[PDB]
Symmetry: C3
Subunit: 146 residues, 3 copies
């Protein structure tokens, strides 16, 4: 039973490791521009790397929630593949943003498409687990029991 | 077995969609006040919408964790209903905060009550799954085995 | 079956309560230095408590994801104990940071060690659930079927 969700757990763990990488880059930028904590404002190069990390952290629970709903209710393999596509787009988004605000846009749109696809698979999976039972009950004249 | 958690998954998915709506409002505010990334400070109207979104994102994993613990250990329906009450209070909090800092207070207190209730249901459910076994073992003189 | 994950759910709930405590300290600091919302910049004492809370929130979903992957795939007790060690190190990190930026360092390194250990247990558990099957299939000449 655990192996039915092992792929989702592996993709989740890869997402956690990618967040540690983003945190490591913010530590390297803090030394490079002497922006010591608790300071978050500084040169534009520091601000971009810092904002890229904040964006990736805020979206991490959204990726996690939809990966698990899609993987359990739609299909495990399809959701894990979309999750991988999302993580790789977020790595490119972070790398682009570090160079410039404009270069973050193409990988940001790619990550938005991957997250919207996970949302769509989760919705399709939830409908596949609810609509057939409702349809069966309506045809049998037992919808109120449901 | 999956349908025993389908309601929690649907409420989780609705929470993800509400976060996309909050992100869409911050994008609209960025254009309205020319506060281009990586900038997060700007006019007070921009700052309120931006802070409302940050608050909703930071609390999203807390809502998610308690919704799932309460839904699995207490009762699925009761937790999903509290989760819906929490999400609707957070939408009103965001809308109020966009108009003024004071107008965010009543829906913020409403969202705090809904989150505290989910916490209480999760605690009640965890106690319901641990205390009876401990009581049974104490009455049988087998508490050390437990 | 639920009681096989009840310890992880209890540790998760304790982490949620600790986040409410961190939020309560930021509210007390807002009154102490008249830094009214939506303002996040202010005196250094306010900024440290505020940054300590933001750091704890951003890392909360990372703690949650690894606690659950390690607890399900490695061993429940070992993961719940590491999770407790992580939460206690984060409380000390918050208390140290409130006094000074330097005093946050020792408990921050302690919390990083606890989180890296949860990551290692999750990886060990995922390998324990995948490598034996791959090894069995390679020895039987059926790896392609897998
Ligand atoms: C209350 C709501 C009312 C009911 C609303 C119903 C709306 C129905 C939406 C249209 C159906 C979607 O159409 C369906 O999409 C999925 C995913 O893209 C496809 O699925 C295929 O591609 C996806 C892409 O990732 C793979 O993960 C999946 O394993 C594969 O089988 C189906 O082959 C297609 O039939
Ligand atoms: C180590 C700890 C020591 C032991 C501590 C024990 C403390 C016990 C707390 C008091 C018991 C709570 O009392 C109990 O509350 C719940 C929820 O409000 C009620 O439950 C009712 O209302 C809730 C409200 O959402 C619904 O979700 C639920 O389906 C319904 O049955 C029970 O009808 C009531 O009996
Ligand atoms: C594709 C990857 C290729 C394969 C890579 C394989 C790498 C193997 C890593 C070395 C093995 C780790 O070694 C193993 O560590 C764990 C945890 O520290 C120990 O486990 C022990 O201590 C941990 C510490 O928390 C307890 O939670 C656990 O219950 C206890 O049994 C094992 O007694 C030890 O044998
Ligand atoms: O991943 C990203 C990153 C960039 C921002 C965003 C794309 C543009 N945004 C839009 C666009 N059209 C919308 C239509 C209806 C409702 C809201 C809408 N939001 C805001 C969210 N997403 C998609 C997303 C985010 C969170 C959860 C689910 C999906
Ligand atoms: O939802 C909200 C939004 C507004 C802030 C807050 C309400 C006031 N806060 C308080 C009040 N009394 C307390 C008593 C003991 C310990 C801490 C306390 N914290 C801080 C948390 N919550 C409740 C919450 C938050 C996170 C997890 C669980 C619940
Ligand atoms: O908990 C903390 C808090 C302090 C920052 C940090 C420790 C230093 N950081 C490092 C150090 N060496 C690295 C080697 C390879 C890849 C990245 C690396 N990151 C950045 C993450 N962690 C560990 C962590 C964070 C998120 C997920 C998992 C683990
Ligand atoms: N740099 C990473 C790692 C987090 C971290 O180690 N933060 C510590 C050390 S810089 C801290 O308390 N920082 C306070 C702050 O970020 O203001 C991140 O931003 O997520
Ligand atoms: N506006 C939403 C969506 C996130 C988003 O699209 N952010 C992009 C485009 S504005 C970004 O990298 N922003 C950098 C920043 O927020 O400083 C939010 O704040 O969560
Ligand atoms: N102080 C806690 C609790 C969150 C909270 O209650 N925030 C409200 C009341 S101060 C809010 O909308 N704040 C806006 C802001 O933080 O700028 C935290 O920072 O997480
Ligand atoms: C509640 C249903 C959500 C559907 C939205 C998914 C959209 C995807 C764009 C590709
Ligand atoms: C609630 C409606 C569900 C719609 C989600 C499916 C959409 C697109 C699949 C690609
Ligand atoms: C797309 C969003 C779909 C929402 C409907 C799914 C709800 C599933 C209810 C299952 C019954 C139950 O849990 O008792
Ligand atoms: C191909 C999709 C068509 C769905 C067919 C549904 C059939 C009848 C809908 C009537 C609902 C009102 C009857 C209520 C009585 C009851 O079902 O308990
Ligand atoms: C660990 C038990 C947490 C109980 C706190 C719940 C409080 C709710 C106020 C209504
Ligand atoms: C650990 C004590 C659990 C208390 C939670 C129940 C409280 C209030 C129910 C409304
Ligand atoms: C309210 C908080 C309650 C905490 C106690 C619940 C712990 C459940 C332990 C179950 C036994 C096990 O998982 O081996
Ligand atoms: C109605 C609640 C009352 C609970 C009754 C508990 C009974 C006895 C508690 C004594 C505990 C010490 C005995 C240890 C020996 C053992 O149980 O293994
Ligand atoms: C993908 C495997 C991750 C292993 C990293 C764990 C490191 C821990 C330091 C103690
Ligand atoms: C993918 C390699 C897994 C390595 C994780 C185990 C490491 C250290 C155990 C302490
Ligand atoms: C350490 C990271 C380990 C990664 C490999 C684990 C993947 C488990 C695949 C199980 C098969 C399946 O889910 O169909
Ligand atoms: C102790 C670890 C040693 C592992 C032994 C693995 C044995 C043989 C590896 C050869 C793989 C190529 C054969 C492909 C044919 C097939 O398995 O379907
Ligand atoms: C972050 C979303 C919560 C995780 C999904 C819960 C797993 C349900 C598994 C039932 C089989
Ligand atoms: C894109 C991959 C297609 C779906 C992969 C299905 C594998 C898991 C099966 C399931 O969970 O029903
Ligand atoms: C950091 C994540 C890397 C994953 C890259 C694999 C994505 C390709 C999926 C097909
Ligand atoms: C975010 C909290 C984690 C999700 C809860 C794990 C689901 C356990 C289901 C066991 C039946
Ligand atoms: C408020 C609703 C009352 C509880 C609803 C119970 C439905 C699910 C049953 C369960 O999970 O035990
Ligand atoms: C955006 C979430 C909307 C949900 C509103 C329904 C709440 C009422 C629960 C009774
Ligand atoms: C936050 C990580 C998601 C929670 C893990 C899902 C629970 C799987 C349980 C299968 C038995
Ligand atoms: C440190 C504690 C050692 C591991 C505890 C194992 C208890 C749960 C057993 C399991 O989930 O396999
Ligand atoms: C706020 C969390 C407190 C938990 C402290 C217990 C950690 C010790 C584990 C051995």
């Amino acid at each position: 039973g655990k192996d039915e969700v092992a792929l989702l757990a592996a993709v989740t763990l890869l997402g956690v490791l990618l967040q540690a990488y983003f945190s490591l880059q913010v530590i390297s930028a803090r030394r490079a521009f002497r922006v010591s904590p608790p300071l978050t404002t500084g040169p534009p190069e520091f601000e971009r790397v810092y904002r890229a990390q904040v964006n990736c952290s805020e979206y991490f629970p959204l990726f996690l929630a939809t990966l698990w709903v899609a993987g359990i209710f739609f299909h495990e393999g399809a959701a894990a593949l979309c999750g991988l596509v999302y993580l790789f787009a977020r790595l490119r988004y972070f790398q682009g943003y570090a160079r410039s605000a404009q270069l973050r846009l193409a990988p940001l749109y790619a990550s938005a498409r991957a997250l919207w696809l996970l949302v769509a698979l989760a919705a399709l999976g939830l409908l596949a687990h609810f609509l057939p039972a409702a349809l069966r009950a309506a045809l049998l004249g037992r919808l109120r029991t449901l």
